A paper describes a structure:
The E. coli 50S large ribosomal subunit is composed of 33 proteins (L-proteins), one 23S and one 5S rRNA. The 23S rRNA consists of six architectural domains that, stabilized by the L-proteins, define the shape of the 50S subunit with its three protuberances. Here, we present a biochemical and cryo-EM based analysis of the earliest period of 50S assembly, utilizing an in vitro reconstitution system with purified rRNA and L-protein components. Taken together, early 50S assembly occurs in a domain-wise fashion, while late 50S assembly proceeds incrementally.
To differentiate states occurring during late assembly, emerging structural features such as the central protuberance, or helix 68 were added to their names (C-CP, or C-CP-H68). In addition, we noticed that the 5S RNP (ribonucleoprotein particle), consisting of 5S rRNA, uL5, uL18, and bL25, can dock on a pre-50S particle as soon as the central region of domain II has formed. This can occur both in early (d12-CP, d126-CP) and late assembly (C-CP) and goes along with formation of domain II helices H38 (A-site finger) and H42 (GAC), as well as domain V helices H80-H88, representing additional examples for rRNA induced rRNA stabilization or folding. However, the CP remains mobile and upon rotational movement of the 5S rRNA towards the subunit interface, H84 and H38 stabilize each other. However, completion of the CP can also occur after the formation of state C during incremental late assembly.
Residue numbers in the entry:
A (entry chain W): 12 to 81
B (entry chain F): 1 to 177
C (entry chain V): 1 to 94
D (entry chain O): 2 to 117
RNA sequence: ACCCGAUGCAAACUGCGAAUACCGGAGAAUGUUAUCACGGGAGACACACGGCGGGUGCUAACGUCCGUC
RNA sequence: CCUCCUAAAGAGUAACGGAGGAGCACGAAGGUUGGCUAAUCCUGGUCGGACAUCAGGAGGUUAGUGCAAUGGCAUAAGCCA
RNA sequence: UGCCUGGCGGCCGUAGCGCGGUGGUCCCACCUGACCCCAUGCCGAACUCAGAAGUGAAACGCCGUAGCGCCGAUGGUAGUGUGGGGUCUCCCCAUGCGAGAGUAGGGAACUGCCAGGCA
């Protein structure tokens, strides 16, 4: 079977445009933060233009990916 | 709430004397009466369970709730989602009247009455029964009964301990063990 | 009670520990309290000689370095899997 | 329980509306008193607030918690908000059913002049 | 059986977890732009050996093949 | 065609390498609004044998999540209306 | 401004579990009846309508309790990038990066806004 595409495409500190795919995942390893969508395949994309940011939020220590506008 | 005044008059007072409590509500109360009729052998047909539910509704003032199998197992040949048990969910004013009627007339008419089983406690003040021959109630006639069911009343009580549960049972008659 | 004499450490890293082990010594540490812990060297010969008794982990040992005597206690010792050579010792000021 | 149940019920809507970063209006109920306040997107700041506890609203209320009291709280918050210039903030029920004093507050706020 | 203290191990176990490598942002120095795109012309299209991290085998094997130099 | 490693913490990466499944189905098993949240053990009892529905405590997702498996799901993506 | 109570955020166990004490000034909670706004796949169960009649019992605010969870060093080791060496199956050397595991120590939170009561 051909290997699927996983991992993070855009990492922290990277400037991205609207609609840019950040991370491809099967489940939800990371959760959308600010200005980040979530497709049917649990794919995170940036709804605006700005820098990527990774953080931890929530009582269960869940990883969150957000976009900060410049 | 017919028995509510009588309870507040006698039970609260005498429990206060016995337990030197501070506040009025510290005395154990009645949370609910779990009129649950677990036939267990309902696999034969649904009509037996329907008749049990009808009898429960006639005894109470509301339609009973039907409980299905919690999970599917092979040893007990029980599947998942199969309606098996029936219960009555009473929480209001009819509870006092029903309990008064029971403690008045349903207690003496027990075959081979050798005392209620006082050693059945969950561990914090819940008292359960496992008796049979539910024909004690005269509200049901012999012309509408096909077998003998079982009464497994398990009183949900605010008692904080087995000692408090025993004290409340003694307060509500409970002749002996 | 035992007088333990050593040299003040000046190099931090695994190189110093390897050099001491080659030279028949080994590193140790003295901590306990809010004061800055001090890294120290131990001479295998004398330290093993004094530790041959069962009082090493029982009585309060004395480090006399640069003419200064300080009381310490032994908590745990790192022992080599098979080689009979001491590796590292932790000391608590008590 | 009750408080944990209410918090877990409300958190979904609260966070979902927080994703939009929109100023909200929240109402808290209690058989004795009713509270209402406007919350900015940050969550650490408020714009307007009104409660049944204060005499300014309890003077003309026979009982602190009632339908008339809820209506008075709603109209008072709607006023304070329109003088402040909230400009059509959203509303949150804080995990409370929309068939009682919450509905009364919402109706009063909508009818006072707000377009939310 | 249940079952407390764990020992002996796990490529198809990880409540912990590196070093490297890849990714993006800022900066001096340095390199004959050493970087990218288009167009013309290709050649090759059975590689060998050695170092390192590996798979499997009979804890022999140039066994039986991979990623990097 | 899909899942585990293989596969050396980005992606990709071979071997008569070894492990399993599928050719679907659903007009609900989808959308919306609201409500709810398990496996197991113990305590109690007549069929109950040690493990039938039932009352409670611990447990806090080891359940469930249609497909074999992997990763996710409390906001539940699970259940009812 | 000092104490007490409720709501809304940051922080996501130094914020946790168990034990004791304390709380009705205000507020919060227990709960009365419900044909009235409400609805039960049955239930005033949830939610909603009429309190001070009593209380802080259960829940919850605060203080202690280091039994316990958790955070957590310094130091040593493992491990590894570049070069070299050997008995090159594996290990050692100069240099750089070097932590979980165990201890020292910390640990019964803190912070921003609004609202009510006692001062």
């Amino acid at each position: 079977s051909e290997a699927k595409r996983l991992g993070v495409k855009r990492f922290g500190g990277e400037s991205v445009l609207a609609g840019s795919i950040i991370v491809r995942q099967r489940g939800t390893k990371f959760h959308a933060g600010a200005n980040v969508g979530c497709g049917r395949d649990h794919t995170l994309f940036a709804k605006a233009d700005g820098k990527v940011k990774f953080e931890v939020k929530g009582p269960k220590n869940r990883k969150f990916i957000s976009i900060e506008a410049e | 709430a017919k028995l509510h005044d009588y309870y507040k008059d006698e039970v609260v007072k005498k429990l206060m004397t016995e337990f030197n409590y501070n506040s009025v509500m510290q005395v154990p109360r009645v949370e609910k009466i779990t009129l649950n009729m677990g036939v267990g052998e309902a696999i034969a047909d649904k009509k037996l369970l329907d008749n049990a539910a009808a009898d429960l509704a006639a005894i109470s003032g509301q339609k009973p709730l039907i409980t299905k199998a919690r999970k599917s197992v092979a040893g007990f040949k029980i599947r998942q989602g199969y309606p098996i048990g029936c219960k009555v969910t009473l929480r209001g004013e009819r509870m006092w009247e029903f309990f008064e009627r029971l403690i008045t007339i349903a207690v003496p008419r027990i075959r081979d009455f050798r005392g209620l089983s006082a050693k059945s406690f969950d561990g914090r003040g819940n008292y359960s029964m496992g008796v049979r021959e539910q024909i004690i109630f005269p509200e049901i006639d012999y012309d509408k009964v096909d077998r003998v069911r079982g009464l497994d009343i398990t009183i949900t009580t605010t008692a904080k301990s087995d000692e408090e549960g025993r004290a409340l049972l003694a307060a509500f008659d409970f002749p002996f063990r | 009670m035992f007088t333990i004499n050593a040299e003040v450490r000046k190099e931090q890293g695994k190189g110093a520990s390897r050099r001491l082990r080659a030279a028949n010594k080994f590193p140790a540490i003295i901590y306990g309290g809010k004061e800055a812990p001090l890294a120290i060297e131990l001479d295998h010969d004398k330290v093993m000689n004094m530790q041959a008794k069962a009082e090493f982990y029982s009585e309060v040992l004395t480090i006399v370095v640069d003419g200064k005597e300080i009381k310490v206690k032994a908590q745990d010792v790192q022992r080599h899997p098979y080689k009979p050579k001491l590796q590292h010792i932790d000391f608590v000021r008590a | 329980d009750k408080k944990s149940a209410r918090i877990r019920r409300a958190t979904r809507a609260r966070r979902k509306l927080q994703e939009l970063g929109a100023t909200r209006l929240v109402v808290h109920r209690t058989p004795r008193h009713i509270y209402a306040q406007v919350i900015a997107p940050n969550g650490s700041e408020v714009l307007v607030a009104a409660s049944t506890v204060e005499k300014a609203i309890a003077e003309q209320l026979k009982y602190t918690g009632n339908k008339d009291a809820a209506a008075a709280v709603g109209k008072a918050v709607a006023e304070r908000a329109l003088e402040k210039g909230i400009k059509d903030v959203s509303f949150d029920r804080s995990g409370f059913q929309y068939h009682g004093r919450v509905q009364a507050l919402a109706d009063a706020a909508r009818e006072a002049g707000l377009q939310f």
